Structure 1
Amino acid sequence: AAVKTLNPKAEVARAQAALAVNISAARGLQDVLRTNLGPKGTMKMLVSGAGDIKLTKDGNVLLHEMQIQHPTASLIAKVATAQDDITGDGTTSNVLIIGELLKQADLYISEGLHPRIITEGFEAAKEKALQFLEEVKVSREMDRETLIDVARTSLRTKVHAELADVLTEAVVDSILAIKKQDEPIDLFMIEIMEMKHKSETDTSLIRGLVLDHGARHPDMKKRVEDAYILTCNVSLEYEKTEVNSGFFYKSAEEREKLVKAERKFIEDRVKKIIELKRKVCGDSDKGFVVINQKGIDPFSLDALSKEGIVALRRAKRRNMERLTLACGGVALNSFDDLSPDCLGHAGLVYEYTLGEEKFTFIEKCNNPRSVTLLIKGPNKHTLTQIKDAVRDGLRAVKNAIDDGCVVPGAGAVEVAMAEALIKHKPSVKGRAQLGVQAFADALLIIPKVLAQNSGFDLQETLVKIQAEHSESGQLVGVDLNTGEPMVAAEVGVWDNYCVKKQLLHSCTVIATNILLVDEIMRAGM
């Protein structure tokens, strides 16, 4: 080798050698991740070096937390990272297409042909598969019963279908009360809190917000009804001057006059708050809750407790955006223009402690446009099951609202897409005839894996599904209960259009680039 001559500590791989490195590593990630695709998949227990249990079967969490040191396994993990970042689901199915695009192409490159001729057939098959996806998409005008069936498909593939009926009502109803009038839905308006109260099948949808910190004073009210939310960013604690000055006093009686003077600027901010509670007709209960992102000294907490004002401290950055929409007030950074117009409103503000950890709840808002899914999982690993399923389900219903068309379910897309490439296979008119066949057989792994994980036969199921599709016009698919070919558009199994669009584009470019790699080497030491 030439690289061994200049650098003797530099390993290398040749043309027929580096292809066998990438193909055998693609089958290694394929055989692991194919046992957890769909609702009938198997759970995986991931233990790190510390000893924490991470029980999940999502394709992005499996590839990141896996003890693998391989350059080909790191390339698929980069493509799988961007799949779970922009659209959520579609990560486990992303790796199986790459593992089949290199396995089906291995049967032609080893039989005399060149790897570039196979890549010419992948592009000609990707253009026909992209045009076929725009013809099978179904627009249902974003009905709230359609979004239930979209969220039910993404949630059943991550839980044992007893929590999927609970989390569907917590994902669809949370994504509708955010934005209207054809506005882009921001996912930062939904807060994800982890509790430990009752059980895993008790995750409810709080219509307001849930804060992870409580009141830092024992004399404050624990349950406040019909409160005013005053969102602040000021620092009520003692802050020094920027120029280091220091006090200078002569007598001991003049020392206490400087301690009263150094807190006068702090107490002027507190007098702006307690006068706002008197200017809102305080002849009633008239509760006041201050979230107050910056910390508060205990001298001002004792002053606000005597007036009946609940004061929190040390909030988050995005709590000044979610609570501002929920309460309807104005997040202020100063007390120079205080008015009742910047105040919020909530019918019930209460707290609850779970083992020296208080949680402030804000509920009963009119039009919040910001909610909180309250996950109450008993174990630490059960909290990671619901959190990875909520962010998978929220990104699933977000794509079904932004895109006006819904793509069909399990086998209603991949079987019809492979049969559409066979009739256009003699249309390429050249040496790339076998490239369309390798792309059509790689798309058929989605009915093959789902029939294998359900315990049914792999080859006997694909014959009956393709027979019901060719002898009709309906997009028939796979059934995870009986194995018979059933249509996915009628049984309530849907999928996202952007997931299948990006699965045809991210897997095609990453397969045409891996097959054209012949000099895998390690140099730089």
Structure 2
Amino acid sequence: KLTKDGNVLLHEMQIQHPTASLIAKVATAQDDITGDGTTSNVLIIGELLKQADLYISEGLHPRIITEGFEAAKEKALQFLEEVKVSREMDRETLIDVARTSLRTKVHAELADVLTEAVVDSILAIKKQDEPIDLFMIEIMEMKHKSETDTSLIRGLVLDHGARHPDMKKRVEDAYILTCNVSLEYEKTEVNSGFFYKSAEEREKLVKAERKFIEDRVKKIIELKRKVCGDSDKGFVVINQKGIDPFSLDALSKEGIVALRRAKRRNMERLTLACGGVALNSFDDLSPDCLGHAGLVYEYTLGEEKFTFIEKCNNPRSV
């Protein structure tokens, strides 16, 4: 593990001295206030302690030293308050600040392609008057062969896709509906979490589950046919359970895509950015909970295809 930061090093070390460990803990406990201020602090403290020890060995009292230190701190605070100056915030100042931060953190090589993306994301997120929040920006990671490779997506990212690709990908105005019903969890026979001895009961339960699945897929097919009826108005369904290919083919024959194996954070971000109600039924209800999607793209790389949705309402997710 390579590191160069101050707090990251001070938090993961094996110090044999208890006083040094306590000093490091006290220094790290005051790092959640500002940005990065844990570094360039132990040197001044050590110099002040050495000066105090020298003055004590010469012959003095710690009370006078503390009073002088407090007076000097007050004078320095007054000088810093009187020497401050204002400056109009624009684009060059933030660019220079990000460049200096990248130079102090990373080497002077790839510090030019990240500052522009950071400034663009800040300008796209900040647009109001209230202070911004660092909770709507998700930083994902992948695995490639190159090194310098960055991207700024203005939409959401879906890791999983579909098991039967090659059908369509140019879906403009799409409707997304989030649910959590049991569409196709497993073909194995089940009951109520307890094994039995008779097979007639479990086979009847399996037949009833299959009939319910058929009724649900017929209901969603008729819903898609009612709310659409053409090829331009597409529909996308997100479900955490599996999807049978025999039903997926019949679904794609009319023009509606259904995804399987979805994470909780993905649907959370989808219902927070768009605004949809998560219900446990596939009935014919009001289309107010259906979220709108502008552009959908499928990126094929590695062993799993990713989905990029953009051009949605209120772009507050970079």
Matched, 1:122 2:78: no
How far is the alpha carbon of 1:166 from its aligned partner?
A: 1.3
Task: Describe the SS at the equivalent of 1:93.
Answer: coil
**Greater shift in the superposed pair: 282-291 or 152-161:** 282-291
Q: Is the 8 A contact 1:236 1:266 kept in 2?
A: yes
How far is the alpha carbon of 1:158 from its aligned partner?
A: 1.2
How far is the alpha carbon of 1:283 from its aligned partner?
A: 0.5
Q: Is the 8 A contact 1:226 1:286 kept in 2?
A: yes
State the distance in 2 between where 1:307 and 1:348 align: 20
Give the count of matched residue pairs. Answer: 318
How far is the alpha carbon of 1:194 from its aligned partner?
A: 0.9
Q: Is the 8 A contact 2:223 2:284 kept in 1?
A: no
Q: Is the 8 A contact 1:236 1:294 kept in 2?
A: yes
Structure 1 residues 140 and 319: CA distance shift in structure 2, 3 A: farther
- Aligned identity (percent) is 99
Q: Where does structure 2 lack aligned partners over 5 or more consecutive residues?
A: none
Task: Describe the SS at the equivalent of 2:31.
Answer: helix
* Residue-by-residue CA offset, 1:163-217 (whole Å, 9 max, x unaligned): 2221112112212323533223221211111123363332121111223333345
**Greater shift in the superposed pair: 337-346 or 146-155:** 337-346
How far is the alpha carbon of 1:329 from its aligned partner?
A: 4.6
State the distance in 2 between where 1:125 and 1:194 align: 48
State the distance in 2 between where 1:242 and 1:258 align: 8
* Residue-by-residue CA offset, 1:320-359 (whole Å, 9 max, x unaligned): 4433454455555665684333233333323334432433
Task: Describe the SS at the equivalent of 2:41.
Answer: helix
* Residue-by-residue CA offset, 1:347-382 (whole Å, 9 max, x unaligned): 33233344324332223345311xxxxxxxxxxxxx
* Residue-by-residue CA offset, 1:412-447 (whole Å, 9 max, x unaligned): xxxxxxxxxxxxxxxxxxxxxxxxxxxxxxxxxxxx
Q: Where does structure 1 lack aligned partners over 5 or more consecutive residues?
A: 1-53, 370-523
Structure 1 residues 131 and 239: CA distance shift in structure 2, 3 A: farther
Aligned pair partner of 1:255 in 176, 187, 202: 202
Q: Is the 8 A contact 1:288 1:310 kept in 2?
A: yes
Structure 1 residues 245 and 251: CA distance shift in structure 2, 3 A: closer
How far is the alpha carbon of 1:260 from its aligned partner?
A: 2.6
How far is the alpha carbon of 1:126 from its aligned partner?
A: 3.5
State the distance in 1 between where 2:53 and 2:219 align: 75
CA root-mean-square deviation: 6.0
Aligned pair partner of 2:125 in 157, 178, 191: 178
Structure 1 residues 286 and 201: CA distance shift in structure 2, 3 A: same
Higher RCO (CA 8 Å, separation ≥ 6 residues)? 1
Structure 1 residues 307 and 90: CA distance shift in structure 2, 3 A: farther
How far is the alpha carbon of 1:226 from its aligned partner?
A: 4.2
Q: Is the 8 A contact 1:231 1:292 kept in 2?
A: yes
TM-score, structure 2 length as denominator?
A: 0.75
State the distance in 1 between where 2:289 and 2:237 align: 12
Q: Is the 8 A contact 2:190 2:202 kept in 1?
A: no
TM-score, structure 1 length as denominator?
A: 0.49
* Residue-by-residue CA offset, 1:28-79 (whole Å, 9 max, x unaligned): xxxxxxxxxxxxxxxxxxxxxxxxxx33322222223334343234334434
Q: Is the 8 A contact 1:197 1:354 kept in 2?
A: no
Structure 1 residues 135 and 289: CA distance shift in structure 2, 3 A: farther
Structure 1 residues 187 and 117: CA distance shift in structure 2, 3 A: same
How far is the alpha carbon of 1:257 from its aligned partner?
A: 4.2
Q: Is the 8 A contact 2:176 2:235 kept in 1?
A: yes
